[PDB]
Design a protein around this nucleic acid. Structure first.
Lengths: 117, 178, 70
RNA sequence: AGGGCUACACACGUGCUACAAUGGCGCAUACAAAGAGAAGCGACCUCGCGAGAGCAAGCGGACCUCAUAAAGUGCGUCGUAGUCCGGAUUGGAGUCUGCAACUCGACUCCAUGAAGUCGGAAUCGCUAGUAAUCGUGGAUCAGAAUGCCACGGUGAAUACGU
RNA sequence: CGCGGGGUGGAGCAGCCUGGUAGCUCGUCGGGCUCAUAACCCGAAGAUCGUCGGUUCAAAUCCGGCCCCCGCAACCA
RNA sequence: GCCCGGAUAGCUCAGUCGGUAGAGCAGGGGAUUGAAAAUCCCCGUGUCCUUGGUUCGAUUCCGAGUCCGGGCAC
RNA sequence: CCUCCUAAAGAGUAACGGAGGAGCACGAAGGUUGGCUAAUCCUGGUCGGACAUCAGGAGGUUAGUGCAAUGGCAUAAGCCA
RNA sequence: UGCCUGGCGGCCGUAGCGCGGUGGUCCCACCUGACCCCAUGCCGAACUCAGAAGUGAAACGCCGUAGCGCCGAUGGUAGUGUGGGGUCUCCCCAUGCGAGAGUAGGGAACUGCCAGGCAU
């Protein structure tokens, strides 16, 4: 749990381990290790607390789940409160990047419902 | 440790000076902290309340009572007399030590601050922080990959109004998303 | 405080001064103070002219002399 | 001129990508054919995470360029956990073509990260350079290719019998 | 008059005995086979238990009132 | 309130003289046909009811009590 | 066979008069010492925010009472050890 | 002799409630500590034990205040005994008895006991 940021497991390698944070993917995790001067394929259990803190100083530098999830909410909400077409599709639960709405789109239209006859 | 020693010298003078109390002892004081999981989940399975107590005990610093139902009808019709909740109750050193593991450790280890933005009190000066998950545990090897369950933190005070009562608590410094 | 209600209180009392390094303290966590939005977007940023990432060597006016013998 | 055909409750045909370990990931490394290109394709150069950029040689087609052939081989890595599988989605930043990418483009990157554990009834294609699987080119085309059209890589089961 | 039984998915039936539980065959709708329909196969949907109240933690179920359907009874000189 | 006699695969019965957990049919998967009706296949489950006791060890062999089914009692 | 009314302010006394129940339960649901106090609603409360468990307040038994109704009860005849 | 504080009463709302003021080196609360006998279905809250400083804050005693609770005449009214009448589903007359409600008004308690302090 609370390793570098609040969301990390052990016995994963350090590239993998940070990925679970939210805001650090595969690319940022590699780059965080490069930044800290840390080898990739080290077991994250192996690193001592002052090394783990060095990762934690860089992990805090970006954005992470308490701050991230508020930001991506605030971005969407600004479109919905504005009422622009982007925001209207975001409100309505149909595709917002303009995808073919006729056939597919069951990521936004979810699990199937019947004809309700 | 430091909380009751801090309350003694500082919070009693501070409240006395800000509210101009009639006599010094009429500063509001800390009355019992009661914790409490409540049921969590799962009446029927009837193991989990006994597991809930054994998790709660560690951070309580005493055995949980195991409360059983009054006449009951809520999310299931519980009837009466079933085991249900959990319940702790602290005062004096045990509470002041607890109140230091809250605040110092437990609150800064809650990520998104479900534990306190703005939160409001009862009708007189008592308050209730329902913490969402898992905090800290005694010496070492804290996580055993358990089964969640937050708990009520109902802290109580001898105070006459909720406006006054939040000058208390706040004199020990209260949350960073408050 | 009956004897058999088993607290872990020797451990819970012990190790009591924890650092900013050891367990962060209550002196850490207000530090990113406020939740910030700035609505003066790019192109509100005084940029009425735009240009790409890199390629900034050799900028002058030459009118399409780029083919090698067309 | 702007809107539309590109909507959505849903139903169906066709195809893609996938559900993994015969693999995904990383780094190193091997050998093609066929075609298009003076409204065009564009090296080398220095710049860019990259898409791309600018500077600029060349080409009329065995010559130059698109164009790094991919799967494969080497080594390390992961351990049956919806994961180093899958990437749908959406945020954000960004590029280009063009009068303009909102309805109604393609692509890069950062982040995020769904269904999916091989599919009910049914059901189709194929006899050998075939199926399966891997990549490459082209027509249209300012800009849109999983489609269609073609090229070559690796390369199988089995056919008793009517 | 009176007494006893009944009121269930679009149809016919079950569960009704101090109780928490919705089941069967048809019909229906979606997919399939078929030139197409029939049938046949697979999947799904469908009852807030006549109605109102009461007792109960809980009621289709037990209890009470009303409407509706059936069986029997409504004579004796 | 007696004497009887039973209490297991879901079922009836039973390999069970104490040295040792099954037949017949029931539900799933596979294998074939106008799916099926219907062949063939591999798993189906028990501390033999709860307790005493003989013994080298025994559920059953010797015993006390609960429930079912059959007689005579009143 | 029990309880209420009719029943006429002692006895409680009829009618196919009005209205409800019992044909048992209990080895603690009995004895005794010791302690304690209710329905309901509000307000705060980690998912039952219509109703668990919690804390605070109002209320003052509106509850309880093995089972019917009447009487009863806080010194509790209630609830717990 | 008085004033004040505590225990046990008597009577048992004219005694209560509200609201406001007020009292602490007598005393009483709260009070701190929990060592120890003791104690919590967890909890020194409660129970219990050991005690200094602190405070009159909450409790409670005292005082003021009628807002409310509460007591409440007289007269009339209802009802009824007995005896009598009639327009008799009910009411009158004789005379005995005479409410409930409501009005005037009262109303914030009176008082015995032993026990301590302070003033006299």
């Amino acid at each position: 749990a609370r390793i570098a940021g609040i969301n990390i497991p052990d016995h994963k390698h350090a590239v993998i381990a940070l990925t679970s944070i939210y805001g650090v993917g595969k690319t940022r995790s590699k780059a965080i290790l490069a930044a800290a001067g840390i080898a990739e394929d080290v077991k994250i259990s192996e690193l001592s607390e002052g090394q783990i803190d060095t990762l934690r100083d860089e992990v805090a530098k970006f954005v992470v789940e308490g701050d991230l999830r508020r930001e991506i909410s605030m971005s969407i909400k600004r479109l919905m409160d504005l009422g622009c077409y982007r925001g209207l599709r975001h409100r309505r639960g149909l595709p917002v990047r303009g995808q073919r709405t006729k056939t597919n789109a069951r990521t936004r239209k979810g699990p199937r419902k019947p004809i309700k006859k | 440790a430091k909380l009751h020693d801090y309350y003694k010298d500082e919070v009693v003078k501070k409240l006395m000076t800000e509210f101009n109390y009639n006599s010094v002892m009429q500063v509001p004081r800390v009355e019992k902290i009661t914790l409490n999981m409540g049921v969590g989940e799962a009446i029927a399975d009837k193991k989990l309340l006994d597991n809930a107590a054994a998790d709660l005990a560690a951070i309580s610093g005493q055995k949980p009572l195991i409360t059983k139902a009054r006449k009951s009808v809520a999310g299931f019709k519980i009837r009466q007399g079933y085991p249900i909740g959990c319940k702790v109750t602290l005062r004096g050193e045990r509470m002041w030590e607890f109140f230091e593991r809250l605040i110092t450790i437990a609150v800064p280890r809650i990520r998104d601050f479900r534990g306190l933005s703005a939160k409001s009190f009862d009708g007189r000066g008592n308050y209730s922080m329902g913490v969402r998950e898992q905090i800290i545990f005694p010496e070492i090897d804290y996580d055993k990959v358990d089964r969640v369950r937050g708990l009520d933190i109902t802290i109580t005070t001898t105070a006459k109004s909720d406006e006054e009562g939040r000058a208390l608590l706040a004199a020990f410094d209260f949350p960073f998303r408050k | 405080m009956k004897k058999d209600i088993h607290p872990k209180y020797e451990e819970i009392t012990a190790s009591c001064s924890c650092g900013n390094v050891m367990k962060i303290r209550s002196t850490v966590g207000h530090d990113l103070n406020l939740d910030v939005c700035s609505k003066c977007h790019p192109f509100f940023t005084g940029k009425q002219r735009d240009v790409a990432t890199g390629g900034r060597v050799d900028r002058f006016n030459k009118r399409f002399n780029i083919p090698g013998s067309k």
